[PDB]
Structure formats: structure tokens, C-alpha cells
Design a binder for this molecule. Structure first.
Ligand SMILES: COc1cccc2[nH]c(C(=O)N[C@@H](CC(C)C)C(=O)N[C@@H](C[C@@H]3CCNC3=O)C(=O)c3nc4ccccc4s3)cc12
Ligand SMILES: COc1cccc2[nH]c(C(=O)N[C@@H](CC(C)C)C(=O)N[C@@H](C[C@@H]3CCNC3=O)C(=O)c3nc4ccccc4s3)cc12
Lengths: 299, 301
């Protein structure tokens, strides 16, 4: 089991640098559109309390500059601007000839996606995270990473789901979907913001227990069962997300012969502590791997 | 913690992966300029995998024995016009130079150092991850049948350093391969026989970096005034499944920034190994050695 992200090449060919005044960050160029965080527009004196409508009104196409540094580098001309939630939709005069097939999806808590971290329009690293139940991610981002992009891929279509915007007071990160809505209803302004209390992603804990059984670690499997409905009611009071079955979990159920309901019962017992024992070398429940991960990695 | 498993963006290496077939055997290869590198056991008949005679096998080959195809991006009219064997790898010469060859070197990676892996099947990139070379010359990767010829690399400036070509999964979950000079890591053999790795060890210098990352995040309950010298720690390490600590400039920057000395963390390690005393560090109840000093310097700064 490793943290496995998609190959980033197709997304690399879409990264650009966006400049507005003396401010810069990353943007994503698809077709004739460049997407980027709207706080490019924001003077340093207005970061803590910005008026984005007033700021956008004071912009012309000419306020915005877009540079591509990767591939055959190019200057693009901004021929239109618009604001969509927390994102800027610039229109440019050239279409990206390396535009992949893509959609815009919103990731759900517990689901994994790949992030391409960039600075000044240059990809520097790639990693994968799961969206946390409190709609933050446990990333690795520094000043200037804003506009870095998160995505999944089904076959050859890339599903863009995340554009990075902020690091909260705790170690964690958040950003917006490409409809422009910030995950977790956080605000793109320079203010201290307190996230909700996080939860265990139940379906990923289940996936992880199936991975243990697949590896010969099954000491926690008992005949006792907890129904999904019973589990989900118990989950409300215990900081666990609602469990929603999928095809991937069922395949692990069929492969191991252990029913989902036996592991939901197991989670309720192990949540109190492992009483001296370990599971896959761990003393705590692991929710950072998905059923798809376990399926694919241990095919 | 602000620490993730950070790989280099794979686009450079994706544009170099190809599929190499010899008879009815297939795996991945690496296309750079007029050369395609792939594991030599693509030459071996399944009946003979357990005991190959790669010298005899190579004599038996002609240029026409090998077929190379690039499926991704712009595809492949690739004709093999030369072949050769270098250690456990084949070096094939092809008549088209890869137009997307990155600046590259071949360097052997050392235990404790991290590198990016591009996992591929039948010439198609499917995933990327990063690993640290274990002190017993294995990596804890995620590889299935057909991943052979997948590549591990690091990147310095514009220069890709290719350090690993995938070859085997040992009887534990664990993986090994060769450097591009042709030598298998750990002197394993590329043949279909059971092989036992040497015992693995904690990478002391990476554990030190991780504790520094803890201090940088305000997690410093484990820091005491007590110290253990490098010499005394390294003598302790031979007795306790830890690698020799070798300090570097990257570790020094961490020590200066935090104001906690390496030797304080060497003492902390000796205590934390015996037990975390019901506490955790960066969300872990056990020492973590899969993050390098360079990792912490880059990701936390
Ligand atoms: C009292 O203030 C705080 C209290 C407690 C926690 C806090 N967090 C933040 C906060 O996150 N600010 C956002 C900015 C806001 C406006 C979205 C921000 O700095 N994003 C970074 C990535 C950040 C930085 C650290 N690593 C993270 O990934 C980024 O790349 C860029 N920002 C700008 C801004 C202007 C121009 C170019 C760029 S580029 C402020 C804050
Ligand atoms: C009784 O012998 C054993 C006892 C105990 C543990 C063992 N492990 C291995 C062993 O690993 N063999 C090598 C192959 C050898 C010869 C280096 C191998 O299967 N490589 C795989 C990747 C492996 C497979 C599972 N996931 C891993 O990454 C691969 O991709 C390909 N192999 C071939 C082989 C021939 C033609 C095309 C391809 S393509 C043998 C063995």
C-alpha cells in the first residue's frame, strides 16, 4: 500500500502563471480559459477584508497577464475577465492545444485525488490526498502554491476537482471546486478561520481492514455484525462519517469472504483502542486509503 | 504535519516509456535518444526463468527479436538496429531518437535517499509514488505483474537522474531492481528463484529530519536537554537496527533554525524507540524514517 497519484503530464501542459499588478500565482489553461484564484486581484492592504465586487469592477482585461513557462513557452493575451465564486475566469486569445478531455467534479469526503503543486506557473511536485470530512486536506503547500490543481482521471478524461487557496491555522489546506465554491465554506481572505472537528472516513477504515485481511491480519474479525443503518446512527455520535457501500467495497467483501457488517462491528470495538495489538503495523485506524486503492494496489 | 509523499511531476519520464516485447514476453522500457533500456529477463523463456543463461540467450537474439512501441502521446515507428547486454539490463539501439528526451544522468541511489517511481504496465504510465531506498536495498513500492521496467528517478535542475529500473517483488511485500549501469541493488539476481533480503534498519538521519519537522510544527514534548554524541549513537545503532548517522548540511539547517542540536535528537531517538510513553508525534506512535532532511527542508522550509 503506497500513496499513488496519477501521472501528472497531461495536467503539467496546462499550468500557467497569472499576474495582476504586483501579485502572482498559478492558473489552469483549458481551451480559451484561464482559471485562477480571485485573490490575485487583491491589494496587500485589502487582503484581510476584501471587496471582490469592487475589485473586479476596477479591473480591465489589461490588469491581467498570463505566462506559460512549461512546454513551448508563450505569452497569451487576456481578452475577457469574469468572476465565478472564488475563482477568476479569464478568457485568452489562444486555445490550449494540449487541452485534455476534462470535466469539473466536486470531490466528496473520503475520496482521493492527485494534486500538482506549482509555483510561478512551474510544476514542482505531485502527491495524493483524500478530502477530509471537515473539507480540508492534509497537503504540502507554501506561499505561491495558490492555483495549484487537484484532479482525478477516469480512463483518459481528467476530472478537475480542486484549486488551492489557503492553509488554515492548523496544518491543513483548502481551496475551491471549479464552480468556484470553497470546500467547507471557508473564505478566501486573510483571516484566522477555525475548521470543524474532523471525522474518520468510515468507508476507508473498512477498506484498510480489508487490506489487512488480504495481508493475513484478521484477528479482529468476529461473527458479530453491525448493520449499515445501525453503524450510521452510531457514527453520528462518534465522529465517523456515514458509511455508503460501493462496488469496490463489495469486491473486497467477496474476495475475502468477510461481510461489510462484520467490519462495521469491528470498527466500533477497535475505536476504543486496540488493547495492545496492531493492525498492519498500526495502533490506530487508518482512513487515508480508499476501497479503489486496496482494489487496485492489491489486485 | 505539512509532510506528504512528494514525487516529481512525471511528465518528463512519461514521454520516454515504451513497451518492449521479445517473443511472447513483454514489459516496459525506457527510450532516451537512440537507446531503449529494459530488463534482460524479457529475453528468457518461461521454462527457463529459474535458471537463465543470459549469455546464451543474447547470442540467440537478432535485432529482429525485439519489438518496441510507444503508445502514449505521439506513437511509435520504432525499429531495433542494435542490441547489447549491460549487467541485468538490455541496451537496444533504435533508429529514431526520442524527440522528448529530458536532460538526464544515471546515478546509483543510496539507502535512506528518496526517489520518484513511475509505475507502468505494457508501456502505459499508470501511477506515481515515492519511496526511500531501504538499508537492505529494497523499496516498499506498489507493483504488480507487468510493472517490470518501471523507472525510479530524481530531478535536480532540469536534469533527470535515473536511478532504478524495476525487476522483482521479494517474498515479503518488498521490491528491488537495478541501476542503469546494470547492477541489481543488493546483489539480488534477476531470476525466478526465492531470495531472502538482509534485515532492514531505521534510517537514523531520516528519523532525525522527521523529529525536526515535529519541532517545526510545535511538537517538541520529546526534546530534553540530554544529548547523545554521534559516536555513541552510532555504536548504539549497530546494536539496535538503526543505520549509522551521517550528518549533512541539510540536517545542519534544521538544527540552526530550531535551535535543537542533532545530539539532543539522537538521545530522543534512543528513548522513543523503547516507547512513545502513550504520546504521539505528528500523529504517529512510532518513529518515521521515510522523510529525508531534504524533504523537510523543501516541504516545511
Ligand atoms: C490572518 O491570516 C491568517 C491566519 C491564519 C491562517 C491563514 N491562512 C491564510 C492564507 O491561507 N492566505 C492565503 C491567501 C488568502 C487571501 C486566500 C494564502 O496565502 N495562500 C497561499 C498558499 C498558503 C500560503 C501558506 N501555504 C499555504 O498553502 C498562496 O499561494 C498565495 N496567496 C496569495 C495572495 C495574494 C497574492 C498572491 C498569492 S499566492 C491567512 C491566514
Ligand atoms: C520462485 O521465485 C520467486 C520466489 C519468491 C519471490 C519471487 N519473486 C519473483 C519475481 O519477482 N520475479 C520477477 C521476474 C524475475 C525473473 C526477475 C517478476 O515477476 N517481475 C514482475 C514484477 C513482480 C511481479 C509481482 N509484482 C512484482 O513487482 C514483472 O513485472 C515481470 N516479470 C516478467 C518475467 C518474465 C517476462 C516478463 C515479465 S514482466 C520471483 C520469485
Amino acid at each position: 500500500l503506497v500513496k499513488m497519484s496519477h501521472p501528472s503530464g497531461d495536467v503539467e501542459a496546462c499550468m500557467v502563471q497569472v499576474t495582476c499588478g504586483s501579485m502572482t500565482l498559478n492558473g489552469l489553461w483549458l481551451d480559451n480559459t484561464v482559471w485562477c484564484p480571485r485573490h490575485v486581484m487583491c491589494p496587500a492592504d485589502q487582503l484581510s477584508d476584501p471587496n471582490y465586487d469592487a475589485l473586479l469592477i476596477s479591473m480591465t482585461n489589461h490588469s491581467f497577464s498570463v505566462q506559460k513557462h512549461i512546454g513551448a513557452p508563450a505569452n497569451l493575451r487576456v481578452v475577457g475577465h469574469a468572476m465565478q465564486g472564488t475563482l477568476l475566469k479569464l478568457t485568452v486569445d489562444v486555445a490550449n492545444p494540449s487541452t485534455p478531455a476534462y470535466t469539473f467534479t466536486t470531490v466528496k469526503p473520503g475520496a482521493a485525488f492527485s494534486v500538482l503543486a506549482c509555483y510561478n506557473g512551474r510544476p514542482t511536485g505531485t502527491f495524493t490526498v483524500v478530502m477530509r470530512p471537515n473539507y480540508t486536506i492534509k497537503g504540502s503547500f507554501l506561499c505561491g502554491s495558490c492555483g495549484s490543481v487537484g484532479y482525478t482521471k477516469e480512463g483518459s478524461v481528467i476530472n478537475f476537482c480542486y484549486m488551492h487557496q489557503m492553509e488554515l491555522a492548523n496544518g491543513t489546506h483548502t481551496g475551491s471546486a471549479f464552480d468556484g465554491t470553497m470546500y467547507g465554506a471557508f473564505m478566501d481572505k486573510q483571516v484566522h478561520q477555525v475548521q470543524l472537528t474532523d471525522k474518520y472516513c468510515s468507508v476507508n477504515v473498512v477498506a484498510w481492514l480489508y487490506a489487512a485481511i488480504l495481508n493475513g491480519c484478521a484477528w479482529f474479525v468476529k461473527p458479530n455484525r453491525t448493520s449499515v443503518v445501525s453503524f450510521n446512527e452510531w457514527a453520528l455520535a462518534n465522529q465517523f462519517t456515514e458509511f455508503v457501500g460501493t462496488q469496490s467495497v463489495d469486491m473486497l467483501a467477496v474476495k475475502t469472504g468477510v461481510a461489510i457488517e462484520q467490519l462495521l462491528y469491528a470498527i466500533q470495538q477497535l475505536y476504543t483502542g486496540f488493547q495492545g495489538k496492531q493492525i498492519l503495523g498500526s495502533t490506530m485506524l487508518e482512513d487515508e486509503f480508499t476501497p479503489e486503492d486496496v482494489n487496485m494496489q492489491i489486485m
